[PDB]
């Protein structure tokens with residue numbers, strides 16, 4: 001087997017000429033030459049705890065069901081022919097030159113790039129939400145870009161089926177998804193089980209594309225809320241009345257009055273239509289927040305908007321001892337075997 005940086009990367013004879021790319025949320029990622037389709041591909045190595053493991057299965061199930069131009073696919077999965085011999089699992093995907101995280105650390109985006117990227121994010125998000133799925137970890141590093149700026153959403157490890165009727169929780173409930181992109185309600189009364197959680201993340205990503213800086217870089221759980229309130233200002237009486245939980249309500253009532261920071265003062269170079277859409281995505285009250293199809297229909301995206309070319313999923317998506325999780329991964333990866 002081939003080796004990469006003192007660790008095995010055993011992708012059989014189909015995939016050769018490995019180059020290290022880095023570490024992702026899963027482990028070693030390389031590119032390799034696919035000797036069958038005659039293109040370089042990306043391969044990630046998954047090695048066996050049960051949260052790392054449950055997120056692997058969740059992602060494989062979703063990505064294998066989804067078919068969309070703005071969502072990364074799975075091209076192949078390499079594993080041993082039996083459960084007994086199964087150890088590492090290699091997931092093969094289209095090679096993408098870069099991602100929005102890397103691009104934003106180094107590159108100023110034209111308004112035309114911001115507009116196009118935002119369109120493709122929302123176009124992909126429409127399909128995800130049409131399948132009754134929430135991504136729940138949208139952020140620049142999960143937005144892949146190729147050399148011609150085609151964009152693909154990746155990393156469905158934290159994804160869930162939408163469940164608004166079970167979205168309520170207490171104040172300060174722990175949350176898994178990346179902190180800077182968390183909607184204010186996660187810190188107050190939400191388990192992140194509604195589509196509005198992803199729109200907030202997209203709003204954060206838009207703002208970040210406008211300035212190359214994260215808009216709400218919280219250093220810890222409650223500091224994230226105070227970054228949000230520092231820009232949106234204090235919530236209105238009506239938006240507070242929507243929060244029935246008393247600990248959450250009373251926390252917000254305890255804070256001094258904070259003025260709204262106008263969007264055009266934070267983003268003096270931004271297109272005015274971009275800022276009107278940003279405001280609607282970064283709405284405090286999740287019931288008032290714009291939905292993906294409305295966002296697509298916003299004047300900012302008029303050059304691209306075409307609902308007949310923004311496909312949806314054919315059906316809503318449909319859903320543990322450690323031995324059972326291994327067997328399910330084996331079963332879910334069976335189609336790539338001889």
Ligand SMILES: *CCC(=O)N1CCc2ncsc2C1
Nearest residue numbers: 042072093094095096154155
């Ligand atoms: C979320 C990251 C992902 O799915 N990727 C697959 C395509 C790809 N190309 C280069 S690095 C990478 C990771």
